[PDB]
Design a protein around this ligand. Structure first.
Ligand code: CLA
Ligand code: CLA
Ligand code: CLA
Ligand code: CLA
Ligand code: CLA
Ligand code: CLA
Ligand code: CLA
Ligand code: CLA
Ligand code: CLA
Ligand SMILES: CC1=C(/C=C/C(C)=C/C=C/C(C)=C/C=C/C=C(C)/C=C/C=C(C)/C=C/C2=C(C)CCCC2(C)C)C(C)(C)CCC1
Lengths: 141, 73, 75, 68, 339, 75, 73, 39, 339
């Protein structure tokens, strides 16, 4: 319920501080736009937006929409980095392709990473994502 | 980290100024200024050119601990 | 070199730098505390390090806040 | 095992235990470790600051599992 | 089902529904369970939102979609466009939910007890065994389904004329219609202004004209097989007939999304809300005219903006299967970008 | 020679920032009231607060390299 | 950085909802969660344990350090 | 020119090319759309 | 395309559109999908600019580039440049967007149901098969496209004379051009002051003369093949015909960017904004007279400056494809710096 978190539209600490919001960019109304945007959040006793991350879809834009947007991009960086590393491993000189990146091969993989979650599920089902424990270098216990 | 947290939260609770911890602990300058620099004021004045008080041994120990910690380096 | 520039920073502010009264009198930045506090590690801790870094830790929300950032950055 | 045969190192003390290697030569002279195995990953070997290790080690028949 | 020549396509778990496309008995079992799940949603979510219904507020602003559908038919509505009876919504929400249990049983019957292929069965199940490359069998299936869609449209015309009465959004009451239109010219004139008809006596007469057309169309498809010109120009594969269905129901989705947002007759404003302005941004979306705050989207902005995306992603689903039916391997995209 | 090219580019950057992004003409009129400043930051993510009032209406990073004092001694 | 840049409202302040919920399950009704012991109608509080008038008075007084109010810091 | 293409395709240059382009995205997104604490 | 004597050149994925050159069936499929994409942008951004338009301020100051094209043509304007209609804007933005889907269907037809080469099949498709080395077939394609562009220019001729009339910015009304200027002397005189045209009758009369020239030249190219002198001076290769078109569309792009900036008749000031001043910093840009606030520009200042930069880089793409047609390898630039 967050009884100790008043909304920022009815928070007197935020209302006395939103009129003195500074401009972060060259726009002279940057502090006014931030005052209207942060009014919909939940504020504490010091009039700053406290974010709720527990899983409520009312506060889905606090963490879940950052979570969905991050994991897509971070999955994209990991998947095209993994797929480039697999492709250059089959070449004559796999070592030199890491310090001297085959840039046309890199752009080909990086634009193909928009369908990484469908490619990750399919490669997990095919067994080419996860290696078996018998086929991996192992410490001597 | 945890004893800095315990001490600074309880310093607000014991003085009644819980908002000093609540508005400053979220960034590390608030820990550095409102906890480390602010609360060390009477500690480092345990002895001064103008005399001593009961925090003189704790002032000497606090610098003694700095010496032993840096000698370990 | 850190002691050299700390000796420089304290001796200038305590015994050289400051404002001038119109009749010729000079008051200093740290009011001449080098003669009685720079003989002791505690005075170096209190009257140099603790006292003169009040300007770098209260600089947040101002033009010198990048120095407040970079002071924590070097820590 | 012939030259060019792919083996997996079952010798536990080695760097390549669980890694695949390629048989370079087998000595027919009664050697205790007659099988020279070449690897694509060098080991830790060398002085501190060296950019590469050694990719070759001699093994016996009991320490190799057939892969290819 | 498109196999690309390979007779032994195994299919993974994500494409696991493609495994029974050549199996007639399992084709019934998944589709009957779909109708079990469809009638369960018509039953449970009628009973879900009749518990959430507040009779003092308008049901459009509450965010309810199934009670305005039954209220437009003329159940539970008094003389002022309000809701006074919670019982006919409870009966219809119970009748759909019990019929979902009969369908949910018959799907488990066709999964377990009935054979996977109906060619094995002897009796009437051998006549029900359909193959995808048999056009004469598929028109019998199509003609019988056109009979029930024609009977459904005549039942709605029957419900308005005799078995009760429809709602009149102009006079704000439940009105029993009498003697709808019989001239074919006004229905032919309704191709232009289809979304602004504003007349019960032409809505029912249009439903009479399409009810007689679908039943007569189902007579023709049962009695007469495909002639041969349709076999030349249309494909008769498993994914090809699904492609025509996904394309056909995407066009029906786009019409129903547009008809929900601008028409006031079949979607009265005291049951649903104000007629939506056709906005467009990075996607087309029908926005609220009155713009009720706190993310309200008053129950016509949920019907129209879901039946556009579900029509768009069936238009994408029609394009996925028609490309598969025509012979595109879809792995040739990956070899186009290969070195 | 390549190292001197690095220093000459660095030297040229100091004279270019003094020419284009500085209050050196403003400081030369009032050396006792205007603070030296030769770095102006772009207004982005709140970092425009670092452009402090160095006097004369100019806003920028208050420089401590002494370049303004060097250039006045150079004429 | 955002406090240094004069914009402390741009801080990412996450309420520790999961730990505030556990304080509510022991009886602290400060955060408004009506769960278990902060809910007087739950079976954990209906059962009439003899600790409950003593415990709920101590957990809601605020003068002790029993279950301190916790925030983004 | 071919070895100039190889030097421009080296690991220091391409990570400085990408991080400049990444900072080019993020600064420009926070210039036209600043102050986004949440969605 | 150009092979440089290498016969079978294997293009990579970034040059992947050079693969379907010298393949007549896939040549249709990419261009029809381009026409599908172009009619989609005409359709969607007309409806996108309807949803953003408010009749308080002018259309040029808002950032609307498709609605003033239809307002100049004389549909959504009541009196004195006031937009009180907006339904013929929705009709045109829906006719174009439906025609995109028809073109989008036909693009996937030539992808799948038609082969990559049209010489494989028989019956009204081998006549549509074209090779780049054949001047007879390319002039048949050119003659039919000139007939379509001639009838398009004559479509504006019938539009102003009969079907509603063009908007007249001088009288601030909409008038039907009853008496166009059918004089070849005054049209030939407009090769100097084409920028300062102010007469609607001279604008339509110039469209009649070019609408009959393209139709008359369209009949000429269909009946008569390219002659012996045109073969000797113009290369009939795949990339040469593209480079002629890229130079031709860049010259039209510069002329249309010049008609946008300085004209008041075909670009009225109340629809697009005030006429531009042709500035030049390090590139020629057209700047507004008055400064629109919040760092915004008029829609005339967005059409003219984008079409200059489009026609500049389409002139550079004309230079890229002319040198490849003429025989410049473009690896010799690498081989000059390496040497
Ligand atoms: C505060 C920290 C500290 C201290 C106390 C020491 C101490 C020492 N350093 Mg240093 N050092 C430090 C940190 C420190 N270092 C770190 C961080 C590094 C790592 C990079 C080094 C690395 C290092 C090197 C590489 C070198 C030194 C050397 C030395 C010696 C300096 C000369 C000397 O004897 O001075 C006199 C001693 C002192 C100033 C220490 C304090 C003594 C106090 C004032 C007296 C206390 C005695 C007490 C009263 C009697 C005992 C009490 C009894 C109850 C037990 C001394 C032993 C140099 C050396 O050995 O030169 C000969 C040397 O070459 N240091
Ligand atoms: C009437 C609907 C219809 C029918 C009967 C089929 C039938 C089938 N399709 Mg599908 N298809 C359609 C519509 C249809 N599709 C649409 C909607 C799309 C566009 C997205 C496609 C695109 C598509 C692809 C891309 C593939 C097929 C394939 C398949 C086969 C197996 C799929 C499977 O096992 O799913 C199993 C089901 C799942 C794995 C669940 C996936 C859940 C998704 C990710 C989320 C969807 C729900 C989401 C939460 C939104 C819900 C909104 C709602 C609350 C309002 C089967 C022949 C496959 C094929 O070619 O096999 C031969 C194949 O690869 N289809
Ligand atoms: C509307 C929902 C729906 C419906 C009614 C069906 C119906 C069917 N699917 Mg199915 N499925 C669905 C959703 C659905 N699917 C989705 C969301 C997934 C992706 C996770 C799949 C993936 C899937 C697989 C992997 C396979 C099926 C198969 C089948 C058949 C299993 C029963 C059978 O024939 O017994 C006889 C069946 C067997 C002798 C072997 C199959 C064994 C079990 C019963 C498969 C059950 C899997 C189950 C449906 C997955 C649940 C997904 C979801 C509902 C939670 C049945 C006709 C199977 C099939 O056609 O094989 C012939 C098949 O192997 N399904
Ligand atoms: C609407 C889809 C559908 C389809 C096309 C089938 C098809 C068929 N049903 Mg039926 N069935 C279904 C839904 C459906 N059923 C459901 C919803 C139930 C529950 C009421 C049943 C329960 C049922 C029984 C219990 C029997 C069939 C059987 C039959 C066969 C024809 C019998 C006949 O001509 O009846 C006149 C054939 C396999 C019979 C058969 O041959 O199965 C072994 C049989 O025993 N059906
Ligand atoms: C839900 C709609 C439905 C479906 C899916 C079909 C499907 C089919 N009909 Mg149709 N039909 C229907 C309703 C339906 N019909 C009704 C309501 C009528 C009007 C009385 C008819 C009367 C009709 C005729 C007269 C013929 C078909 C034919 C066709 C085929 C060609 C489609 C066509 O004409 O392209 C456009 C196609 C398989 C042709 C055929 O050969 O049947 C297979 C044909 O000659 N239909
Ligand atoms: C763990 C990493 C982390 C997280 C989750 C965030 C997340 C965020 N930062 Mg960031 N930030 C971080 C590290 C982090 N930062 C660090 C390391 C610095 C110091 C260099 C900054 C300094 C910073 C500033 C100064 C600004 C952001 C802003 C933001 C927002 C980005 C909105 C956007 O571009 O879309 C978002 C709330 C912007 C914002 O909108 O603040 C709310 C903004 O102005 N950040
Ligand atoms: C009518 C237009 C036309 C036609 C049909 C062609 C056709 C072709 N050209 Mg192209 N060319 C043209 C215009 C044209 N060109 C123009 C305008 C340029 C100048 C930039 C060039 C310069 C050019 C080069 C430099 C090359 C060709 C080549 C090619 C071939 C393959 C192209 C490919 O697969 O790239 C697919 C497309 C991409 C991989 C995308 C490239 C990424 C750029 C940066 C995208 C541009 C983004 C831009 C900002 C978009 C916004 C525009 C606006 C809204 C702001 C093909 C025969 C290639 C060749 O030599 O033939 C084999 C080749 O190397 N052309
Ligand atoms: C879109 C414009 C267009 C295109 C691309 C062509 C292209 C062609 N014209 Mg032309 N032409 C057209 C419209 C066009 N014409 C119109 C408007 C007319 C009527 C005036 C003609 C009448 C015409 C004549 C009379 C002749 C050409 C010829 C030619 C060819 C030589 C080009 C030339 O003269 O180089 C400079 C070339 C294939 C010659 C040709 O090859 O005939 C088929 C030829 O004799 N044209
Ligand atoms: C990013 C891509 C982009 C976009 C979205 C547009 C957008 C615009 N362009 Mg364009 N332009 C672009 C690329 C693009 N352009 C480039 C790459 C070129 C080459 C440099 C041009 C060259 C250019 C010129 C030449 C002109 C425009 C203009 C136009 C406007 C109307 C065009 C029109 O109605 O077509 C007309 C529709 C057709 C040609 C389709 C065929 C119609 C047939 C032939 C008629 C029917 C015949 C039938 C038998 C009856 C529109 C705002 C006009 C304008 O006002 O610009 C300032 C204009 O004069 N464009
Ligand atoms: C085939 C198959 C499948 C599917 C299935 C499904 C999914 C279906 C569903 C089904 C269903 C889903 C059914 C239905 C049922 C229902 C129910 C079970 C309900 C219950 C309830 C009742 C019966 C009652 C109620 C009531 C009323 C009416 C009145 C009031 C009171 C009460 C509330 C009591 C799967 C995938 C699994 C697997 C494979 C095979």
């Amino acid at each position: 319920d967050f009884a100790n978190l008043t909304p920022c539209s009815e928070n007197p600490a935020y209302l006395a501080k939103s009129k003195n919001f500074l401009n972060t960019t060259n726009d002279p109304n940057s502090g006014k736009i931030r005052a209207e945007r942060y009014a919909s959040a939940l504020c504490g006793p010091e009039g700053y937006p406290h974010l709720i991350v527990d899983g409520r879809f009312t506060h889905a834009g606090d963490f879940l929409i950052p979570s969905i947007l991050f994991l897509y991009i971070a999955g994209w960086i990991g998947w095209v980095g993994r797929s480039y590393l697999i492709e250059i491993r089959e070449s004559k000189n796999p070592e030199m392709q890491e310090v001297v990146i085959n840039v046309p091969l890199a752009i080909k993989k990086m634009l193909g990473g928009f369908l990484w979650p469908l490619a990750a599920v399919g490669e997990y089902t095919s067994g080419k994502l996860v290696m078996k424990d018998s086929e991996i270098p192992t410490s001597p216990r | 980290w945890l004893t800095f947290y315990w001490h600074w939260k309880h310093l607000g609770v014991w003085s009644g100024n819980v908002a000093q911890f609540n508005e400053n602990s979220t960034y590390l300058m608030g820990w550095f200024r409102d906890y480390l620099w602010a609360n060390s004021a009477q500690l480092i004045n345990g002895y001064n050119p103008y005399g001593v008080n009961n925090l003189s041994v704790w002032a000497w120990m606090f610098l003694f601990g700095h010496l032993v910690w840096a000698t370990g380096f | 070199l850190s002691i050299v520039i700390f000796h420089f920073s304290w001796k200038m502010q305590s015994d050289v730098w400051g404002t001038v009264s119109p009749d010729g009198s000079v008051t200093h930045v740290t009011l001449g505390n080098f003669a009685q506090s720079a003989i002791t590690i505690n005075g170096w801790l209190r009257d140099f390090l603790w006292a003169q870094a009040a300007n770098v830790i209260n600089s947040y929300g101002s033009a010198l806040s990048a120095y407040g950032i970079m002071f924590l950055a070097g820590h | 095992l012939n030259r060019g045969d792919k083996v997996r190192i079952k010798r536990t003390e080695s760097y390549w235990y669980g890694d695949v290697g390629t048989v370079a030569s087998v000595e027919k002279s009664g050697i205790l470790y007659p099988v020279i195995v070449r690897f694509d990953r060098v080991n830790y070997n060398g002085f501190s600051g060296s950019a590469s290790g050694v990719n070759t080690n001699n093994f016996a028949e009991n320490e190799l599992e057939l892969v290819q | 089902m498109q196999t690309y020549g390979n007779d032994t396509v195994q299919y993974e778990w994500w494409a696991g529904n493609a495994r029974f496309a050549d199996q007639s008995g399992l084709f019934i079992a998944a589709h009957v369970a779909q109708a079990a799940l469809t009638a369960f949603w018509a039953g449970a979510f009628t009973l879900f939102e009749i518990s959430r219904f507040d009779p003092t507020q308008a049901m459009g602003d509450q965010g309810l979609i199934l009670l305005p559908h039954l209220a437009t038919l003329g159940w539970g509505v008094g003389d002022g466009g309000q809701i006074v009876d919670t019982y006919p919504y409870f009966v219809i929400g119970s009748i759909h939910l019990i019929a979902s249990a009969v369908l949910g049983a018959g799907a488990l019957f066709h999964t377990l007890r009935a054979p996977a292929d109906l060619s094995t069965l002897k009796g009437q199940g051998k006549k029900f065994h359909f193959t995808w490359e048999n056009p004469q069998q598929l028109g019998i299936i199509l003609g019988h389904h056109l009979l029930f869609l024609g009977a459904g449209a005549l039942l709605l015309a029957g419900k308005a004329m005799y078995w009760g009465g429809l709602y009149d959004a102009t006079t704000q009451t439940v009105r029993l219609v009498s003697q709808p239109t019989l001239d074919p010219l006004v229905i032919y004139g309704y191709q232009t202004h289809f979304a602004s008809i504003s007349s019960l006596e032409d809505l029912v007469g249009g439903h009479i004209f399409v009810g007689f057309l679908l039943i007569g169309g189902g007579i023709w498809h049962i009695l007469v097989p495909p002639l041969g010109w349709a076999k030349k120009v249309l494909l008769f594969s498993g994914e090809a007939i699904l492609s025509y269905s996904l394309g056909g129901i995407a066009l029906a989705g786009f019409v129903a999304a547009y008809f929900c947002a601008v028409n006031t007759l079949a979607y009265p404003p005291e049951f649903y809300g104000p007629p939506l302005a056709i906005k467009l941004g990075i996607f087309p979306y029908f926005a609220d005219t009155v713009e009720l705050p706190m993310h309200a989207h008053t129950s016509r902005a949920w019907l129209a903006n879901a039946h556009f995306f579900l029509a768009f992603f069936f238009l994408q689903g029609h394009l996925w299967h028609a490309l598969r039916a025509l012979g595109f391997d879809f792995k040739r995209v990956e070899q186009a970008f290969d070195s | 020679f390549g190292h001197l090219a690095v220093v000459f580019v660095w030297l040229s950057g100091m004279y270019f920032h003094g020419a284009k992004f500085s209050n050196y003409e403003g400081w030369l009129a009032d050396p006792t009231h205007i603070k030296p400043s030769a770095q102006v930051v772009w207004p982005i993510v709140g970092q425009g607060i670092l452009n402090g009032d160095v006097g004369g209406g100019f806003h920028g990073i208050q420089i401590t390299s002494g370049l303004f004092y060097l250039w006045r001694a150079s004429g | 950085v955002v406090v240094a840049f004069g914009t402390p409202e741009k801080q990412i302040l996450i309420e520790p909802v999961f730990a505030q919920w556990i304080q509510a399950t022991s009886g602290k009704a400060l955060y408004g969660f009506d769960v278990l012991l902060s809910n007087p109608d739950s079976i954990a509080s209906t059962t009439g344990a003899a600790w409950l008038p003593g415990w709920l008075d101590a957990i809601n007084s605020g003068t002790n350090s029993l279950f301190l109010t916790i925030g983004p810091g | 020119m071919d070895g100039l293409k190889s030097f421009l395709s080296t690991a220091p240059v391409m990570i400085m090319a990408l991080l400049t382009f990444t900072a080019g995205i993020l600064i420009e997104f926070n210039r036209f759309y600043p102050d986004l604490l949440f969605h």
